[PDB]
Amino acid sequence: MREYKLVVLGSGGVGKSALTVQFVQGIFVDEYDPTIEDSYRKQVEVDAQQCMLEILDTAGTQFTAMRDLYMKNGQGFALVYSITAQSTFNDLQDLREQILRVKDTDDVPMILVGNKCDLEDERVVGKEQGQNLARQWNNCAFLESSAKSKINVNEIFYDLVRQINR
Amino acid sequence: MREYKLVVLGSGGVGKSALTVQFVQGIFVDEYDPTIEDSYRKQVEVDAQQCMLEILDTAGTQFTAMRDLYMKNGQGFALVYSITAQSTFNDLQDLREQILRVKDTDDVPMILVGNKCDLEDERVVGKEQGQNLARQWNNCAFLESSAKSKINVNEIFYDLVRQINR
Amino acid sequence: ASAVVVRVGIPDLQQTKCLRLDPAAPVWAAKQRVLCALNHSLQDALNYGLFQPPSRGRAGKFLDEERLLQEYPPNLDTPLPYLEFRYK
Amino acid sequence: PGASAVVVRVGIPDLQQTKCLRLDPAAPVWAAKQRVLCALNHSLQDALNYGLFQPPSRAGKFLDEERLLQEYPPNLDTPLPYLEFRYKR
Ligand SMILES: Nc1nc2c(ncn2[C@@H]2O[C@H](COP(=O)(O)OP(=O)(O)OP(=O)(O)O)[C@@H](O)[C@H]2O)c(=O)[nH]1
Numbered sequence: 001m002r003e004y005k006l007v008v009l010g011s012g013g014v015g016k017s018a019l020t021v022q023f024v025q026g027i028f029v030d031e032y033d034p035t036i037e038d039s040y041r042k043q044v045e046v047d048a049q050q051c052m053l054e055i056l057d058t059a060g061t062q063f064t065a066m067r068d069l070y071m072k073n074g075q076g077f078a079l080v081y082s083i084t085a086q087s088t089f090n091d092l093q094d095l096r097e098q099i100l101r102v103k104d105t106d107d108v109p110m111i112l113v114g115n116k117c118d119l120e121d122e123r124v125v126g127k128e129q130g131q132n133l134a135r136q137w138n139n140c141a142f143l144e145s146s147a148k149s150k151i152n153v154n155e156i157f158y159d160l161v162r163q164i165n166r
Numbered sequence: 167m168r169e170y171k172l173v174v175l176g177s178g179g180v181g182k183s184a185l186t187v188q189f190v191q192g193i194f195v196d197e198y199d200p201t202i203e204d205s206y207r208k209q210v211e212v213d214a215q216q217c218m219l220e221i222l223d224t225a226g227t228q229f230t231a232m233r234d235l236y237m238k239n240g241q242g243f244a245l246v247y248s249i250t251a252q253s254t255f256n257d258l259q260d261l262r263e264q265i266l267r268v269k270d271t272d273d274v275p276m277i278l279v280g281n282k283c284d285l286e287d288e289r290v291v292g293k294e295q296g297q298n299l300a301r302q303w304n305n306c307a308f309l310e311s312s313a314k315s316k317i318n319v320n321e322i323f324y325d326l327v328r329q330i331n332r
Numbered sequence: 333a334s335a336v337v338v339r340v341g342i343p344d345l346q347q348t349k350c351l352r353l354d355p356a357a358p359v360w361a362a363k364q365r366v367l368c369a370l371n372h373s374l375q376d377a378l379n380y381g382l383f384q385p386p387s388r389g390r391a392g393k394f395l396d397e398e399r400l401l402q403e404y405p406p407n408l409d410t411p412l413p414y415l416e417f418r419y420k
Numbered sequence: 421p422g423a424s425a426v427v428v429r430v431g432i433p434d435l436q437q438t439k440c441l442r443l444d445p446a447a448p449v450w451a452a453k454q455r456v457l458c459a460l461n462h463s464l465q466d467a468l469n470y471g472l473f474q475p476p477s478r479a480g481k482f483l484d485e486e487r488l489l490q491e492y493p494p495n496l497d498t499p500l501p502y503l504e505f506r507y508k509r
Pocket residue numbers: 010011012013014015016017018019029030031032033034035057058059060115116117118119145146147148149
């Protein structure tokens with residue numbers, strides 16, 4: 001049984017914690033409690049194999065000392081934005097470049113996540129913006145998700161696992 | 167706490183059981199054991215309400231007297247085919263007509279499911295075929311899923327709950 | 333030679349399964365079929381026994397594993413005979 | 421249990437069959453026998469009287485069903501560990 005060190009990144013309020021808790025516990029966190037650093041461990045079955053996922057849910061893009069540590073130790077990275085907030089989308093390019101500079105390679109398990117897709121009446125970021133960005137990131141994996149509706153949540157973390165096994 | 171009686175139907179071998187066991191238990195059933203009738207109960211959180219889901223996983227057309235009792239009693243229906251077998255997609259039409267006869271109306275919570283979307287190389291039923299079929303069924307909900315990859319599994323049952331709630 | 337359909341409820345899993353059981357074979361062999369249809373989802377699985385639940389004019393009791401299945405007349409409640417798989 | 425699995429070839433001399441199965445090393449021997457029974461497709465009479473059996477590597481013996489399967493180290497001749505399923509009474 002192998003361990004997978006997964007890291008959830010993004011600006012404040014995009015739904016990093018809600019996605020994590022929805023995947024780990026199966027409930028929706030309606031509160032917004034600003035995160036410093038939380039970690040979760042969960043044994044799941046991915047592609048017929050038992051896996052120990054350790055999910056690190058981080059502070060805003062902030063606590064710089066910890067940020068350097070989880071970029072060197074993380075095996076897969078979910079870069080999360082909110083479809084309701086253009087600035088949180090623009091914030092991701094810098095993150096992606098920080099990760100690659102620390103890993104010293106572009107071959108880094110990664111997934112781009114547009115969260116809050118249930119909020120169609122507040123969407124400012126089109127799905128095709130995220131698709132085009134992911135394409136620029138060397139055909140990065142891309143998903144629109146909803147932690148509130150439990151849409152494409154486990155798909156985020158299971159895809160990271162498959163990337164790491166490759 | 168409300169109860170929801172969901173029914174998974176389709177021809178044999180399409181993934182009815184694997185989708186159900188994936189959702190309820192979180193494991194992928196690699197074997198094909200022909201079902202007569204299996205039931206599962208599971209409490210989940212849907213749109214911030216605790217819900218008791220009763221999932222009936224049914225046989226492949228076989229057991230015609232049994233069929234009428236689970237069609238009268240089901241509140242929502244997942245109509246499942248396999249994207250690798252054209253015959254299982256054609257069988258879904260006479261299955262939906264039987265739900266509409268038994269319940270006397272066409273406002274029945276329903277989702278059409280093309281399963282085994284992880285088997286792209288073996289695809290025979292194009293995605294647009296499924297989208298067209300859903301549209302002519304009174305703009306029916308439509309998903310392509312993979313019980314093996316855990317893609318769009320819970321999204322099937324959560325959407326039926328939402329249709330029942332509305 | 334023969335087979336009949338029996339609905340078996342496993343309360344500890346909150347699930348029910350319709351199984352083809354051999355009425356002419358012992359109860360332990362019917363329990364063997366129940367075990368094989370659960371894969372390995374039941375912890376401590378061998379401490380479970382087939383149980384006839386209470387029903388109309390009929391008290392609940394564990395089936396004697398050395399008797400043939402057909403020596404227990406089915407309950408008349410339901411369209412299909414019903415048994416449960418219960419911990420001891 | 422649950423974390424791992426090991427492939428073991430199991431010979432059933434009364435059926436003149438062998439089968440390679442995944443068994444749980446951290447589970448009791450009786451749960452490994454349960455997996456063997458579910459692989460035979462009810463082809464055995466008095467199957468519950470059969471027990472898992474270690475061939476001589478020497479002299480054989482039945483495995484204690486209360487022990488974890490991993491308490492019996494594997495024979496390292498074979499590429500796959502080998503066990504037998506024989507009548508125990
Ligand atoms: N409508 C809707 N709201 C969401 C969704 N996901 C998160 N939210 C809300 O957005 C707010 C911020 O969510 P968090 O998960 O705490 O955001 P975060 O800052 O990235 O997570 P932290 O790592 O804890 O700081 C919370 O009130 C959530 O309930 C979603 O998918 N849909």
